[PDB]
Structure 1
Amino acid sequence: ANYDVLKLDGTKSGSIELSDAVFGIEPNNSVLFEAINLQRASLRQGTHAVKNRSAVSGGGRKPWKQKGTGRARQGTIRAPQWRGGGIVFGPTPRSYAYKMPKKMRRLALRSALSFKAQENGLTVVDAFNFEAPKTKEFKNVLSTLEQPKKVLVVTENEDVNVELSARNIPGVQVTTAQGLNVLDITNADSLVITEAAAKKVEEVLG
């Protein structure tokens, strides 16, 4: 319910009220697992192919007559048991993406955010004050907030200077409130979200 709001220097600048319907639910692990699996599968390109016996070059003619030579009967030099022959089955190009009900997606996002809330992985900041990109300044800011290595930074809209300053730091990822996804939240050890971004997330996810 009541979460402390911090200044980038690390001082308590105030307090915020975040709804228990977004950050205070019991995480649903089955739905969250399904969401993570869905997102990882949607990332697959699926470009993988082999040549079956029809696609391998040549192989039109019968290699030798059916009977009389003493050899095994053969139909084409590109049959699967032949060296250099066609592949039986094997990979064929396809998509791995699938879908789940919208309510399950929302429940998964809420579960990830709530898990961050329980494990003390939620840090609310007053506002990011970055006029010019400087990776060193953002690094020091994360130092002053006592943040772990894996941190997800959430701003209300696309903040270009924050994204530029935090881009090159390994373990640090930046997203907007609209762009929150389960993989990104789950990977992070802690969440650093502004007051406005927290309010927007609470509004959109109810």
Structure 2
Amino acid sequence: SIELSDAVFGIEPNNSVLFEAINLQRASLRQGTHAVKNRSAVSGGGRKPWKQKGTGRARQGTIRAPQWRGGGIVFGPTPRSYAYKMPKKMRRLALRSALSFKVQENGLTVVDAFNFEAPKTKEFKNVLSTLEQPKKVLVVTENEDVNVELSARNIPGVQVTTAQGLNVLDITNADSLVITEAAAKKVEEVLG
């Protein structure tokens, strides 16, 4: 009933670009927030403990040296960022690869409009069980559906997204995809 051009949902996936996109997204939602103290930042240790020579002991300059107990750390963690970027043309080749791979293994379900008037988890649970859907499902619409997102969100294993919120991680983590005709048309028109 619904025709979709083979440019999306009908290409051969690119595994290298998909791996790069997965690693990029997963690394870009990680914050540093870690720090240690070096020689200068540890409290005290200004004077020399004993004279350079004359007594039989190893020569020392401060009580906060790296080899003392309680001294400063050398070459430790320091706060930074882990995110990086890739060409725009490769960010879109990775997404079509995910959609095509999902289509390949019969994990695509085109349905009519979701007709919900009030949030209710049991109705959507029954709807999911009627359509024979797996444990992990991603459901895609065109705009923000309040009555669809309020329900279907306490069920462990279901997430809701729009057409311009699609992810490489959401598609790969999900086991099957359920979409609407308007959402499918928007996905086909936006991508390429």
Deviation at 1:120, TM superposition (A): 0.6
Deviations 1:96-154 (A, max 9, x none): 00001111110010000001100111111111111111111111111011110110111
Deviation at 1:82, TM superposition (A): 1.0
Residue aligning to 1:150: 136
Q: Please give the alpha-carbon distance, in whole angstroms, between the structure 2 residues aligned to 1:138 and 1:71.
A: 78
Q: Please give the alpha-carbon distance, in whole angstroms, between the structure 2 residues aligned to 1:28 and 1:79.
A: 52
Of 178-187 and 127-136, deviating more is 127-136
Q: Please give the alpha-carbon distance, in whole angstroms, between the structure 2 residues aligned to 1:67 and 1:200.
A: 81
Deviation at 1:69, TM superposition (A): 2.3
Deviations 1:26-67 (A, max 9, x none): 000100000000000001011111111111111111122221
Number of residue equivalences:
192
TM-score by length of 1: 0.91
Q: 1:127 aligns with which of 113, 116, 126?
A: 113
Q: Please give the alpha-carbon distance, in whole angstroms, between the structure 1 residues aligned to 2:55 and 2:182.
A: 84
- SS of structure 2 residue aligned to 1:21: coil
Deviation at 1:68, TM superposition (A): 2.0
Deviation at 1:81, TM superposition (A): 1.1
Q: 1:112 aligns with which of 84, 98, 108?
A: 98
4+ runs of 1 displaced by more than 2 Å? Answer: none
Q: Please give the alpha-carbon distance, in whole angstroms, between the structure 1 residues aligned to 2:72 and 2:139.
A: 51
Q: Which structure has greater strand proportion?
A: 1
- SS of structure 1 residue aligned to 2:24: helix
Deviation at 1:170, TM superposition (A): 0.6
Q: Please give the alpha-carbon distance, in whole angstroms, between the structure 2 residues aligned to 1:93 and 1:118.
A: 43
Residue aligning to 1:8: none
Q: Which runs of 5+ in 2 are unaligned?
A: none
- SS of structure 2 residue aligned to 1:16: coil
- SS of structure 1 residue aligned to 2:151: helix
Q: 1:70 aligns with which of 25, 46, 56?
A: 56
Residue aligning to 1:81: 67
Deviation at 1:171, TM superposition (A): 0.8
Q: Please give the alpha-carbon distance, in whole angstroms, between the structure 2 residues aligned to 1:46 and 1:115.
A: 34
Residue identity (%): 99
Residue aligning to 1:175: 161
Q: Which runs of 5+ in 1 are unaligned?
A: 1-14
Q: Please give the alpha-carbon distance, in whole angstroms, between the structure 1 residues aligned to 2:48 and 2:147.
A: 69
